């Protein structure tokens, strides 16, 4: 099996990366956007079970909670579902301010990689995609915010997830999308 | 020489990577989008000739053919051209479902890296871009699809392409862009 | 210290990478766009001072100057500012043709990573983002162009930037976004 690196108290395999497609740099409050995000096994070790976690982060206010946004997703060709508030970590508060809400977006991928027992194994070069629909409620803004993709994997089958609400005991390479929640640019000319 | 990995029977140099810009996460049937894709030599071995391949994949149906979409491209500062249906691979039907249509988008880049003999050598840190205009015919949809970038290179000068229709005898790191072909998100609010 | 590669006479740590979000593949002359770009320490060596450099490149004309566009940005949670032309490199003219304008987008990041003395250290896994507003004046176009992200860092505390107008004495991994400046695609159908 692969060897992990230490970030905080967690193990991280950089061979499991993630990519965003279609995240806008400015999101209008109240408006619904759809984007896709996918994690890909760039290593050679096939993980027996995998799922995506998504973290919503505002750097310049700490009142954001899970309830302030709507979140739906679909794992590859499986059906759409509403992201489960109980499958989230509790709000986390960096010492410099802000807040982030970690949301689990795991599940079978429609029988592409997923297996009849419910596991989503990740062989080399393979990938799992989440199509995501996201909307923040009106009246909430942020001037420096991000979505973060955090691949969760189970090192070995019988291992169990380490953070309550999120999938996995080891994690992949964090990928970022920075955005603003508010109004788009005035014309510079 | 450079190091290859064996996937299927093919040699793959991961140092030749690809990036997408401007791929939407939802594509409207009948509508034309333009995006860009470029492959970059992140390694140190200079390849004597290179060209881009693009793969369109539907995970949830196997009736897609080259004819069901229109595809134009332009290599860096060269002129626009229509992609050649004869420079495509035949339909492929993965066991994990669907069909994919592999398309060659090769050619001189307008004299940036390209040479008078038509070759596009790829030195370290250098990159080649295809600007791509894509439209699917009205009336065809997909709920989980991808565009894939597959950089093709000729290991040795005068080597011959190994997959009929596609450029290259060895290949780079596959890059994915997941999307849906259909209607956009309804308002969550 | 970390390990560098030599590109021209400059030292490059490929471990400091950059990502774009929201760069359109086609930019309309005169119009203002907002995108975000961020650089991340994918290595283990914490850099004592870092700042983003942004290169605007036209491959097919050499008359582009800094005066031909308007450029505003904000480092993470800090406020917007107009990019300083005196904090740009002189126009550079590749031997194959074209021109590129290297612009410094440095500054405190709003107290996230930045320190009271003004430096923006970059620990492992941490990141700095620029939100960018860009507009080209009407009447200049380009059919093959790019934005390039070049993380600039200070190897040792108190080091001096090496290229005039740009931040850093060593640099990170160049990241590209290819686009056209002109009219969007006509309908292919
Ligand atoms: C991911 C895309 C990649 C990896 C590239 O493709 C970059 C390559 C090729 C470019 O596309 C240029 C045709 C066009 C140049 C595009 C970007 C140009 C620079 C960032 C330019 C300014 C800052 C300096 C960075 C240090 C580290 C090297 C020096 C010389 C200089 C650099 C430059 O002068 C470049 C070059 O002379 C050639 N180069 C440069 O970055
Ligand atoms: Cl990643
Ligand atoms: Cl790649
Ligand atoms: Cl690339
Ligand atoms: Cl990737
Ligand atoms: Cl990079
Ligand atoms: Cl010139
Ligand atoms: Cl054009």
Numbering used by the authors:
A (entry chain B), B (entry chain A), C (entry chain C): 9 to 197
Authors' account:
In this work, we report the identification and characterization of a small enzyme AvmM that can catalyze the construction of a 16-membered macrocyclic ring in the biosynthesis of alchivemycin A. We show through in vivo gene deletion, in vitro biochemical assay and isotope labelling experiments that AvmM catalyzes tandem dehydration and Michael-type addition to generate the core scaffold of 1. Consistent with the apparent molecular weight (66.2 kDa) determined by the gel-filtration analysis, AvmM was characterized as a homotrimer, with each monomer adopting a jelly roll fold. The overall monomeric structure comprises of eight main β-strands arranged in two parallel four-stranded sheets, and three small β sheets. Using the DALI search program, AvmM shares low structural similarities to some components of large proteins, all of which adopted a jelly roll fold. Additionally, AvmM has a long C-terminal loop, which interacts with adjacent monomers to stabilize its quaternary structure.
Exhaustive efforts to get AvmM in complex with the substrate 3 by optimizing protein/ligand concentrations, pH values, temperatures, precipitant concentration or even rescreening the crystal condition were not successful, probably due to the relatively low binding affinity. However, we were able to obtain the complex structure of AvmM with the product 2 in a resolution of 2.5 Å. The overall structure of AvmM-2 complex is highly similar to the AvmM apo-form with a r.m.s.d. value of 0.18 Å for 574 Cα atoms. The enhanced polder omit map shows a clear electron density for product 2 in the active site. The rigid cis-decalin system interacts with F18, W97, I171, F179 and L182 through hydrophobic interaction, while H108 shows a weak hydrogen bonding with C3 carbonyl group. Additionally, residue Y15 was found to form a T-shaped π–π stacking interaction with the tetramic acid moiety. Furthermore, analyzing the B-factor of AvmM structures indicated that the loop1 and loop2 in chain A are highly flexible, and clear deviations of Y15, K16 in loop1 and E104, H108 in loop2 were observed by comparing chains A between the apo and complex structures. Importantly, the orientation of the docked substrate 3 is highly consistent with 2 in the active site of AvmM-2 complex structure. More importantly, the OH-23 hydroxyl is in a syn periplanar to the pro-R hydrogen at C-24, thus after syn-elimination, the specific twisted 3 would generate a Z-type C23 = C24 double bond. Interestingly, comparison of the docking result with crystal complex suggested that the formation of 16-member ring causes the polyketide side chain to move away from Chain B of the protein, disrupting the hydrogen bonds observed in the docking results. The formation of the 16-membered macrocyclic ring makes 2 more rigid and dramatically changes the conformation of flexible side chain in 3.
